[PDB]
Amino acid sequence: STTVTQNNNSEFAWPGASSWALNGRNSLMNPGPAMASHKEGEDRFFPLSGSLIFGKQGTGRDNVDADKVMITNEEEIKTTNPVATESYGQVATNHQSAQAQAQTGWVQNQGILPGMVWQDRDVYLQGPIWAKIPHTDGNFHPSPLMGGFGMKHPPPQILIKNTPVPADPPTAFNKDKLNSFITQYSTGQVSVEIEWEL
Amino acid sequence: SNDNAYFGYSTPWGYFDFNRFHCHFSPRDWQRLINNNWGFRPKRLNFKLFNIQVKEVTDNNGVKTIANNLTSTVQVFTDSDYQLPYVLGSAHEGCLPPFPADVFMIPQYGYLTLNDGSQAVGRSSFYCLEYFPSQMLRTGNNFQFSYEFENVPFHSSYAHSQSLDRLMNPLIDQYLYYLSKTINGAGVPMSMRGGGDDDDGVPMSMRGGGASGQNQQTLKFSVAGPSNMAVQGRNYIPGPSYRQQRVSTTVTQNNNSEFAWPGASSWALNGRNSLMNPGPAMASHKEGEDRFFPLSGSLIFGKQGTGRDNVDADKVMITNEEEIKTTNPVATESYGQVATNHQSAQAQAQTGWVQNQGILPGMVWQDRDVYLQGPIWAKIPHTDGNFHPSPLMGGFGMKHPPPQILIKNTPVPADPPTAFNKDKLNSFITQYSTGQVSVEIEWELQKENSKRWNPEIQYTSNYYKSNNVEFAVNTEGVYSEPRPIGTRYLTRNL
Amino acid sequence: FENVPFHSSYAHSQSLDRLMNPLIDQYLYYLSKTINGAGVPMSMRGGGDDDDGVPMSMRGGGASGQNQQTLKFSVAGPSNMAVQGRNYIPGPSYRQQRV
Amino acid sequence: AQAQTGWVQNQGILPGMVWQDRDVYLQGPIWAKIPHTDGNFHPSPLMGGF
Amino acid sequence: SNDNAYFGYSTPWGYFDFNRFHCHFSPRDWQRLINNNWGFRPKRLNFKLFNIQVKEVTDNNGVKTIANNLTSTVQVFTDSDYQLPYVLGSAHEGCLPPFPADVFMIPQYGYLTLNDGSQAVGRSSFYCLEYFPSQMLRTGNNFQFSYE
Amino acid sequence: QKENSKRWNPEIQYTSNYYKSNNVEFAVNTEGVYSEPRPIGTRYLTRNL
Amino acid sequence: QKENSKRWNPEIQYTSNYYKSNNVEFAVNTEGVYSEPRPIGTRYLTRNL
């Protein structure tokens, strides 16, 4: 909750965070599956993993207050995608009989089922555009979880570097690589023209 | 038991099976393949039967003798329309021996339909292979056919040179923030007058202490930087899982109890339980914990001359699915954690372990590796739906795999009675046949084009002196495959 | 009508877990035993003395209770179909109450 | 610790899964409109049909 | 901590990043897009580098001075075959500033391979960007390429 | 999509019941009320996996 | 001059060591010092006399 007094009085930023494990290392489920940020009207709530959060102009790096950040709102997709801070639903967990009552359990996480429909995470003006789909044997709906367009062959990386210009070398041969360079930097213009289809 | 109940038929027919890599690749060739290509796949197949010899055995007074029966025939046909229950791609014994010199016996064909215990329901199907047109050949007749492998993706014969969680630039920060603090400060006593009085736990509201215990809660955000990679936002997440029990090679570490089946992961199909023997492709273990393996496990072959039942660990070879730890979750670990409540002023944030995780949009993964001794292909079940129908045992899945090739010696009646009898003949000349088989497969290669500076990992033999040569013959003339050999040696970026 | 797959107006004449050849073994092994044997008392002298539960280490019984653990492997055969390795598994589920 | 198992009450898709779709009836529906969304999986109408 | 362990390399090279919408759309344009279309997507890309100026800094007795070094060059190349670890699309800072008037600094290129704690396993890959053909340009030389 | 099975034994078929009855299945009443006595699937013929 | 051997068993190959280490063989230091950890011949593949 944005109204702090409603939150538990304890550090749960990482302890109570959703996460996945890869070879003994844990990574926060920072963006996660595209899910509605909250139930109707409960606008003060947001997923701890959250909806992308940008910094306001001139916001610091560390331990910044809530007012100096912008938390995206994934609400428009509540029509098809389950709420992030809610259970998917309930399932039976036994065989109700003459002796036993019908029991249900909460579905905290639900993988794809045949018949599922959903929207992908929205894109923002400040948001990313594309991502490189990892070159793997398998993947499902490789739409970047951070939002945007997934591509096996995205716009190629463009690497630039100032060519090293040696200072005055010794007048006697030395096998060691030169470590004395003329201090330089370069400047210029860049042009990026993209054609978008509407 | 009910889990092992079945109903089917055994038929006199035999069948050809070459659905293992060592049927086609010498250990030398498998090395050449492994060390130099990023991927490969079958394209064409050409099969031949020739130099058929039908021999008749005579046994009079224990004195056995074998003679040629030139007029006898052998029947052969191909299940070109997949009208017979597909037996290949169930990791069955009786393939072509890996060593060219070995003479092998053709496996018998048998199949299973629907069963209700040891009974057969109305649906159950009975197939008669005689009710198929088949070529007949005496010695001096040769059979052959060609097959086209349908489009199948290249098998990834590479390991990733970077992991899913380590794909960022270690020099630059994201333009994204994360929740870093939910608590700030602590309850405060305050001050007044020169003398100092501090509130202590236990003071009642009737004694003046009306203050509640803590107001520390706050929302502090930090930039996802190089210093905290674990928190950074990512576009892709690790593949699906289905937790498997962890077993150690150093026995003393395992629980003192029988958990081979009780603590095994399994799926249920119409009241019957089947072990999740191969399971979802998952890393065999965490870094360094090499002594561990999933109870379901990574395929396990037997060493040369290993028995059938209750064999010790040293007489088996357990495959190691480690190279895929870059994208696939560990088999003996949880997928991760999920919130299980609504943390509030009264309730603390709670998490639960994800023991099994179905596909999610954004998942990426590698399929199980293939081995020299491993299967090649499998028949994708003809069903309404399926997902990533890559054979879980490893290999190439096909709707129309290499057709089954069934062979049988045509029955040669003994001398019938000189008076008519309606009963089917049950007195036959004892016969068996022999000949040669030829299997020619054309494989397509996907050569490596890496810009890696440092040398790669390569499959090599050990130079250190030894009694026998690896992948050679014994002093008894027994060929043996000393270890399993994967395909993932060369590396490639994610 | 846009291209739609044919509706499957058939039932399968064999199940996912029963697709092998009931005559041949796999070339794959499975873990069949994790326990072998039991704690052993031993022998000496003509007279026989057997360790019993309750004997303390101060009374001479320093032996721990069980060392039985072992790793025995068996071939996945026709006799044990439930354990055999398979390429394909049954479809997704979402448990429903039974009435 | 002894080996422990838990029941899988609900299982999402896994690579290697195979299945049949719900049958269709004489009284049953024929078709359905696949919702116009970014994503969907095996959009076979759960009530059966095309 | 173990969750933040990594192994990789930092290289002198910089890189261009324009993988954010405000790099291409003015707030006015984003509004026009948003309010009138049901969908959109990129088709083509055209990139240019030009008006290169290589300056040499001299610092004698704290007295700093900048002069042009006309003969100096800058190296540029495109990872057309994705042979380098792809750093873009990790929501990294150092894209083109949203405001056209802003002058920005090019981010440094660095990458991470396989790690076991703070150590590198045999698989870990080392890449040298020098081991790539790249165009060299003095002032008065212009680079450009197109992408589909 | 016609069946091309190589099954030897006869298949399950949807049939009406020969045993005598007051009304015909999938016919009209004596009131002129048409009725569908039971649901009818499509999965009678068999096929290998 | 490519190899055309009819040897059945696998050959000796030059490989890097998988075992974990501080630096990568034939890579740069943490100081930015490239180093060649060992001499590398050419005689790995075999051939009859």
Added chain:
Amino acid sequence: FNIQVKEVTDNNGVKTIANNLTSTVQVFTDSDYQLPYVLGSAHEGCLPPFPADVFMIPQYGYLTLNDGSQAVGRSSFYCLEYFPSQMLRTGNNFQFSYE
């Protein structure tokens, strides 16, 4: 290619480097092996194995006949200036091919 001839000025210890655009560099190839062949004596000062390294060009020197520290009548003296060589300012590129 991309030759840059720089001039160093050192006034009162204060060293400074500037381009000398009009200055040239001389290059030529001993195509007829008329000079004492120095290569293939396992000498230092080759191109560094690592592409990123900037190296210093080794100085050329040679040895003829000697009798102790003295030179006999046979001993040959070579002047590299007595060879035609290309001259290039910045903006000029040299190249050749060999079989």
